[PDB]
Enzyme design. Structure first.
Site, PDB file in Angstrom:
ATOM      1  N   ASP A  50      37.499  -5.751  15.302  1.00 16.87           N
ATOM      2  CA  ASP A  50      36.750  -6.963  14.943  1.00 16.87           C
ATOM      3  C   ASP A  50      35.365  -6.526  14.480  1.00 16.87           C
ATOM      4  OD1 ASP A  50      36.153 -10.079  15.128  1.00 16.87           O
ATOM      5  OD2 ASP A  50      34.546  -9.077  16.227  1.00 16.87           O
ATOM      6  N   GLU A 121      10.672  13.305   8.037  1.00 15.10           N
ATOM      7  CA  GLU A 121       9.896  13.862   9.136  1.00 15.10           C
ATOM      8  C   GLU A 121      10.091  12.856  10.262  1.00 15.10           C
ATOM      9  OE1 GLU A 121       5.843  14.323   7.722  1.00 15.10           O
ATOM     10  OE2 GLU A 121       6.494  15.412   5.918  1.00 15.10           O
ATOM     11  N   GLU A 123       9.528  11.411  13.757  1.00 12.99           N
ATOM     12  CA  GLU A 123       8.656  11.356  14.928  1.00 12.99           C
ATOM     13  C   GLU A 123       9.330  10.517  16.011  1.00 12.99           C
ATOM     14  OE1 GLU A 123       4.863   9.873  13.464  1.00 12.99           O
ATOM     15  OE2 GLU A 123       4.216  11.899  12.900  1.00 12.99           O
ATOM     16  N   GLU A 177       3.444  16.184  18.479  1.00 13.87           N
ATOM     17  CA  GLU A 177       2.612  15.329  17.623  1.00 13.87           C
ATOM     18  C   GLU A 177       1.279  14.938  18.310  1.00 13.87           C
ATOM     19  OE1 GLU A 177       1.609  13.714  14.813  1.00 13.87           O
ATOM     20  OE2 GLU A 177       2.947  15.039  13.669  1.00 13.87           O
ATOM     21  N   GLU A 184       7.899  15.769  16.773  1.00 10.52           N
ATOM     22  CA  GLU A 184       8.360  15.600  15.371  1.00 10.52           C
ATOM     23  C   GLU A 184       9.360  16.705  15.027  1.00 10.52           C
ATOM     24  OE1 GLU A 184       5.492  14.329  12.268  1.00 10.52           O
ATOM     25  OE2 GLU A 184       6.238  16.030  11.106  1.00 10.52           O
ATOM     26  N   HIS A 233       8.203   9.768   7.700  1.00 12.45           N
ATOM     27  CA  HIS A 233       7.694  10.091   6.373  1.00 12.45           C
ATOM     28  C   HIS A 233       8.862  10.676   5.591  1.00 12.45           C
ATOM     29  CE1 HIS A 233       3.715  11.052   8.674  1.00 12.45           C
ATOM     30  NE2 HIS A 233       3.751   9.742   8.437  1.00 12.45           N
ATOM     31  N   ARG A 304      -5.720  13.079   0.367  1.00 15.95           N
ATOM     32  CA  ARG A 304      -5.838  11.794   1.066  1.00 15.95           C
ATOM     33  C   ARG A 304      -4.485  11.355   1.621  1.00 15.95           C
ATOM     34  N   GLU A 321       5.967  11.859  -0.965  1.00 17.98           N
ATOM     35  CA  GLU A 321       6.142  11.591   0.453  1.00 17.98           C
ATOM     36  C   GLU A 321       5.800  10.125   0.717  1.00 17.98           C
ATOM     37  OE1 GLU A 321       3.717  14.089   2.990  1.00 17.98           O
ATOM     38  OE2 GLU A 321       4.521  13.183   4.828  1.00 17.98           O
ATOM     39  N   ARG A 323       5.217   7.461   3.163  1.00 17.13           N
ATOM     40  CA  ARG A 323       4.804   7.504   4.560  1.00 17.13           C
ATOM     41  C   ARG A 323       4.846   6.173   5.315  1.00 17.13           C
ATOM     42  NH1 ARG A 323       0.116   8.571   5.577  1.00 17.13           N
ATOM     43  NH2 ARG A 323       0.255  10.261   7.124  1.00 17.13           N
TER      44      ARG A 323
HETATM   45 MG   LIG Z   1       3.242  13.593   6.569  1.00 19.24          MG
END
Ligand SMILES: [Mg+2]
Ligand SMILES: Nc1ncnc2c1ncn2[C@@H]1O[C@H](COP(=O)(O)OP(=O)(O)OP(=O)(O)O)[C@@H](O)[C@H]1O
Ligand SMILES: Nc1ncnc2c1ncn2[C@@H]1O[C@H](COP(=O)(O)OP(=O)(O)OP(=O)(O)O)[C@@H](O)[C@H]1O
Ligand SMILES: [Mg+2]
Lengths: 432, 429
Positions: A50, A121, A123, A177, A184, A233, A304, A321, A323
């Site tokens: 089901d 990545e 975490e 982390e 991580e 990420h 940044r 990436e 994030r």
């Molecule tokens: Mg990163």
């Protein structure tokens, strides 16, 4: 054939039970335990069940022979697993199955010679247990990249990575982390389907081995207030005709047009994607300024920490990436949503906004509207309303999956909004 | 090559994980755990990581060691790493790179510094899994079992170190309750600093295995002796000991006097590196083995710098001001830079105060020109900020991070209302 190899591993390892593993719309693993005598029936006509469980009626489980793995925790009697696709009784694939949704979006990308590779990545937190129930108390008193005895979870993390390698899994690196008891584990890049299967396996393995040690592993976005939250990420790259479609040695910054367009597409639908990649009410307690988690909708280079970051590595390792996602998302649907939005950027030719290299958090509110910088949804209801209106993502994920996400999220939000939390009693009961 | 030897030890001992070890500006060990499949990538292009932006870990093949405590039989290994920018330039903020730079600059003048530290530490009990400052034993100076209850754990510590190419001289119980000391032989500043970090990691790991907590804090208990890191130091010029001159008075060369003169000239500033915690200045108080006044002398008096009797190749100076909570990479770099400036400019040291100092009155000490080490962390940081030689030797990046971390700790400590104040004033005022 692969079925013959499965039965050979059965007799060698003395496998007596097989778990027909699958996942609901919320990314939670579900299964049907069958004795090894029924394995021939499972690989042939399939096992009936089901399917109201998928939503989170009569359906069939279709095991993927490539995903047959013996669970390295022995019971002399061993156990095995098989990730299965869901089919209707007639034979047609169930479009409510999250794994089928990602498969469809990948087939649509393959039609244009594209294949998406993802490297997340992951975490997570390792908490203590109190009276058999899980808590949010960190099991260790550690910080960023800390070493034992400050990191008390080195034995369990060592076991997680080893158990994964025994299941055809390649890990890049693992570390402690920023937050207390946070860890991580970064995986190597692979096609979106193999990666999503691997993400589900990691959560299952980590939570199983944590229990074995009297601990509780959780992939909740923000289990503790005032400390860093767990993120997922996602390193993403597109490959056209074998080559990395994001690399152009002649273009400025050696970044191809297809990268800037893919980025433009995912940033156009990012408010809507947040409902999939950040699906819990708690996910929006992580999307708060002051921690690694991105809040403003911007893209930039490595210097940044923005929503989308373009790392320095070039050549075959050119990537972006993303994030914003958290590890509580359904990986099958998260990658499907990113692929559909990113491919619309490539196809419909969408230019991304100007890269912002200045620190966003340091800027004043007056300067952010001048450059047209938006914000990611502040609540689950706010992201669900944006997702409802994004007809591209609704069509890419299918009406069945889209409706199930909206129903589950609204049921959670309507229950959460009416609740009277302890913060309110602490703030008003004594004075008013 | 060394890489081939590493892979031979891998298949032999069944190593499945390796620890890419490194240290921050405060001497705290940090690492990245990688499966053995990624070891070829680590020794080749290196492993990327976030230093905050992104950087690369460059393992030193000479530091490959198998951790003797076996894994689940899955063995484990470690590699001390140098940090490097993505383009290929060494990161000037890495403490290990700073010592290496100061070592090369000494090597250009044919000098090589050898260090042999005396590592003092405490072994405390644990209450509800948290560490305490309650001594495990009620032992004293050079005491023997059953007075010294940590004789089994210390024996395991020394054994584990010898299994990792470590040569030790002797170990003994110290003056304070639950305090111990492990002295190891002299070696070049870089190998010694790597060994100091390993010592702290091994002792703290082995202590947790026995339900105890090892700490290298300078003053964990008030009213008892504090932990020090007395550093035996000597320079070697062209294979021979640059501190031995058989024709000079006292068999001490001019190079020793000038080196001593240089480190005593910058000792206020060096204190910010060698005594970096707020607690380090609770150890620098009269009444214990810790030096307080800036003087140098022979083996008779316990001063800041002590010239032991042994001559020949064993000619050396014992700098007794550092504590074992300092970053060894930066502590030895600061000593070598200040000491080499003494040699380079021929700075004469003050007269050897052989007279017992703690017993003398302040008025006399003022007449002799005897100074005092900084009384607070802020006082040492202010002196360190003005010392241009040391800021340039450690690099602007490292010097700035030391000042930021120390100021952040001092600004938090100074505003705090301690229990001593409530015990002293709450009932009366
Ligand atoms: Mg990163
Ligand atoms: N093309 C890619 N697509 C998606 N993710 C990638 C890609 N390349 C690298 N990554 C991610 O970045 C991480 C490490 O990046 P790196 O600079 O080492 O490139 P790499 O491909 O992993 O190098 P190598 O091929 O030697 O493993 C990996 O864990 C992976 O998840
Ligand atoms: N030339 C030197 N430079 C720096 N430190 C030294 C030197 N010689 C000895 N030491 C240190 O002083 C301590 C005591 O030295 P000792 O009097 O036993 O002479 P030693 O036999 O040469 O010592 P070692 O066997 O360690 O070389 C040792 O722990 C050692 O590390
Ligand atoms: Mg001594």
């Amino acid at each position: 054939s692969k079925e013959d190899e499965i039965f050979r591993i059965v007799e060698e390892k003395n496998v007596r039970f097989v778990r027909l593993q699958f996942v609901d719309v919320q990314g939670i693993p579900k299964n049907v335990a069958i004795p090894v005598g029924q394995l021939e029936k499972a690989l042939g006509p399939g096992i009936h069940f089901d399917g109201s469980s998928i939503e989170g009626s009569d359906m069939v489980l279709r095991p993927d022979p490539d995903t047959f793995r013996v669970l390295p925790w022995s019971g002399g009697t061993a156990e095995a697993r098989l990730i299965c696709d869901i089919e209707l009784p007639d034979g047609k694939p169930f479009m409510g199955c999250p794994r089928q949704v990602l498969k469809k979006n990948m087939e649509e990308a393959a039609k244009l010679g594209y294949v998406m590779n993802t490297g997340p990545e992951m975490e997570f937190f390792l908490f203590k247990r109190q009276d058999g129930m899980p808590t949010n108390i960190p099991q260790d008193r550690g910080g960023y990249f800390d070493l034992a005895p400050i990191d008390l979870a080195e034995e369990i993390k060592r076991e997680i990575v080893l158990v994964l390698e025994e299941m055809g899994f390649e890990v890049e690196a693992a570390h402690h982390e920023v937050a207390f008891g946070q860890h991580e584990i970064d995986f190597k890049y692979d096609n979106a389907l193999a990666t999503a299967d691997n993400v589900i396996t990691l959560k299952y393995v980590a939570k199983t081995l944590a229990l074995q040690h009297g601990l509780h592993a959780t992939f909740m976005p923000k289990p503790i207030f005032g400390v860093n939250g767990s993120g997922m990420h996602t390193n993403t790259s597109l490959f056209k005709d074998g080559k990395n479609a994001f690399y152009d040695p002649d273009a400025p910054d050696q970044i191809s047009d297809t990268l800037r367009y893919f980025v433009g597409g995912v940033l156009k639908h990012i408010r809507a994607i947040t409902a999939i990649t950040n699906p819990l009410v708690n996910s929006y307690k992580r999307l708060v300024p002051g921690y690694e988690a991105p809040v403003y909708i911007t893209w930039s280079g490595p210097n940044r920490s923005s929503l989308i970051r373009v790392p320095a590595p070039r050549g075959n390792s050119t990537r972006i990436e993303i994030r914003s996602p958290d590890p509580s998302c359904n990986p099958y649907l998260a990658f499907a949503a990113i692929l559909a939005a990113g491919l619309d950027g490539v196809k419909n030719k969408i230019e991304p906004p100007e890269r912002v290299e200045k620190n966003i958090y340091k800027l004043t509110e007056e300067e952010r509207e001048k450059l047209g910088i938006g914000m990611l949804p502040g609540t689950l209801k706010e992201a669900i309303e944006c997702f409802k209106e994004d007809e591209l993502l609704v069509s890419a994920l299918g009406e069945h999956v889209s409706q199930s996400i909206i129903n589950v999220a609204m049921a959670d939000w309507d229950s959460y909004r009416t609740q009277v939390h302890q913060w309110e009693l602490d703030r008003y009961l004594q004075t008013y």
